[PDB]
Design a protein around this ligand. Structure first.
Ligand SMILES: O=S(=O)(O)OC[C@H]1O[C@@H](O)[C@H](O)[C@@H](O)[C@H]1O
Ligand SMILES: [Ca+2]
Length: 487
């Protein structure tokens, strides 16, 4: 098997945010098309409940929590994945695929954080760790620098107006969302009150690069355009395309063709904008007859958040829409909604269409699963936590992983066998008011029967001492002593 592999990888899109998992409160027709065209997963997880660790886990096949510095990265964060590492991109390139990444990166660029010259080539970047083509946002939509990077170079730079970036202090004379809120077309709810770009304040300060600044209205359009351009450009030979959307992540600034259309304000409108992007990819493959020999994978980097730092009506217009489906918590949390994400695999003539799998799966296993598919032996040390299971990911086998370690925003761990879930005691608040999410951090051990109690309402650690011991021990077995070590 040497098929094309296309990831459509969403940001902050929860189990109940797409209509494929049963929601009647939003209509995502293209995502339903994909589901009825392949296999839909009800128990597939991101490695982490935040972006940078989930993305690190996926491309490296290593649990993010094994390394300090794999947490939510700043725009000016240095390359977390160094060229010495064997990457999923490397696997494909070495197997003779063309490789491209389009959209959100959020794994750092350049050598030393806060010291990059954004007017010069970023070294090292995406093109040093197995990607032949890159068209990326440095970090998230709400983080400076708000420019696009093509093959590790910022595009549309006027050298008479060079970019500067600091997360330490403002450049004197540059206004902020905090001090100059009259310059804003969208107001912050918490943080997001530093440098201004197209009337929206961000996290971090910048100056110059006016010509290189993106427009948030046209991000979905620009990224999806480059994604389709890349599929059209490589229609003759095997390619791996990692298409990672801005969509559902703040600031939520959908194309005018989507403003108002969901009734749930910008947040809902950006789910429809995501569904549009999915449409563009599926149609490009169908136009070119690429649906004969293409594996399409749709998923999210982590669970959902309603208010994630802007006054964008997300709370007021949610109605009875449940982003996390029936599952407790959301983004940042130890609870299921933090990591249990929409996941579809579609592969014509391999995967039975309209199929469902309750297998315990994780995005960390794709690396090893693609080695199994390509029938190639992984180098010593590569994808160390990645468990191969092509049979499970193609819906031909009920049984997924036997054990899975999940991580939250405070880097506390949980372990599950698909049925029981043990949350290891750790530091951190029980609740974040700003984001209105239960984080699941506790000094007390927690045990939940996800089959009898999927809402994780009823902690039964006390009533199952022998089971708590078995699963505490199993967690540490998988941790080794390799937790929070240096990059
Ligand atoms: O998905 S993530 O990229 O990990 O999100 C990172 C988050 O950091 C937090 O400081 C903000 O409240 C969020 O708005 C978002 O920027
Ligand atoms: Ca995210």
């Amino acid at each position: 098997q040497r098929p094309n592999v296309v990831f459509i990888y969403a940001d902050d899109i929860g189990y109940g945010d797409l209509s494929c998992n049963g929601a009647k409160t939003i209509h995502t027709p293209n995502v339903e098309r994909l589901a009825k065209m392949g296999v839909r997963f009800t128990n597939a997880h991101s490695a982490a409940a935040t972006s940078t660790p989930s993305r690190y886990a996926m491309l490296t096949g290593e649990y993010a929590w094994r390394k300090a510095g794999t947490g939510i990265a700043a725009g000016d964060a240095a390359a977390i994945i160094r060229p010495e590492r064997y990457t999923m991109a490397n696997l494909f390139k070495d197997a003779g695929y063309n490789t491209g990444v389009v959209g959100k990166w959020h794994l750092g660029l350049g050598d030393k954080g806060g010291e990059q010259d954004w007017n010069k080539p970023l070294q090292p970047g995406t093109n040093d760790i197995g990607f032949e083509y890159s068209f990326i946002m440095a970090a998230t939509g709400d983080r400076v620098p708000c420019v696009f990077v093509e093959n590790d170079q910022v595009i549309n730079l006027d050298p008479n107006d060079p970019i500067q970036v600091s997360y330490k202090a403002n450049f004197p004379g540059e206004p902020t969302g905090k001090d100059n809120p009259e310059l804003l077309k969208m107001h912050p709810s918490h943080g997001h009150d530093q440098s201004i770009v197209n009337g929206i304040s961000r996290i971090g300060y910048m100056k110059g690069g006016k010509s290189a600044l993106w427009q948030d209205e046209k991000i979905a359009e620009t990224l999806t355009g480059k994604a389709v351009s890349f599929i059209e450009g490589h229609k003759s030979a095997p390619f791996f395309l990692y298409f990672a959307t801005q969509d559902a992540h703040v600031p939520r600034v959908p194309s005018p063709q989507f403003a108002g259309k969901s009734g749930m304000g910008p947040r809902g409108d950006c789910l429809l904008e995501f569904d549009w992007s999915v449409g563009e990819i599926l149609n490009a493959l169908e136009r070119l007859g690429l649906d004969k020999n293409t594996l399409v994978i749709l998923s999210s980097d982590n669970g959902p958040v309603v208010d994630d730092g802007y006054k964008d009506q997300a709370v007021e217009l949610l109605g009875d829409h449940t982003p996390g489906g029936i599952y407790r918590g959301g983004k940042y949390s130890s609870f299921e909604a933090g990591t249990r994400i929409p996941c579809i695999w579609s592969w014509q003539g391999v995967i039975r269409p309209g199929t469902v799998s309750d297998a315990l799966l994780c995005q960390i296993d794709w690396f090893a699963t693609f080695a199994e598919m390509l029938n190639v032996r992984l180098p010593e040390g590569a994808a160390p936590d990645s468990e191969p299971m092509l049979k499970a990911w193609t819906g031909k086998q009920k049984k997924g992983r036997e054990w899975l370690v999940l991580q939250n925003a405070q880097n506390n761990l949980s372990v599950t066998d698909g049925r029981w879930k043990y949350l290891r005691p750790g530091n951190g608040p029980a609740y974040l008011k700003a984001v209105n999410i239960e984080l699941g951090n506790s000094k007390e051990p927690q045990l939940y029967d996800l089959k009898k109690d999927p809402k994780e309402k009823n902690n039964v650690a006390g009533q199952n001492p022998e089971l708590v011991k078995k699963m505490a021990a199993q967690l540490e077995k998988i941790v080794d002593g390799r937790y929070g070590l240096p990059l």
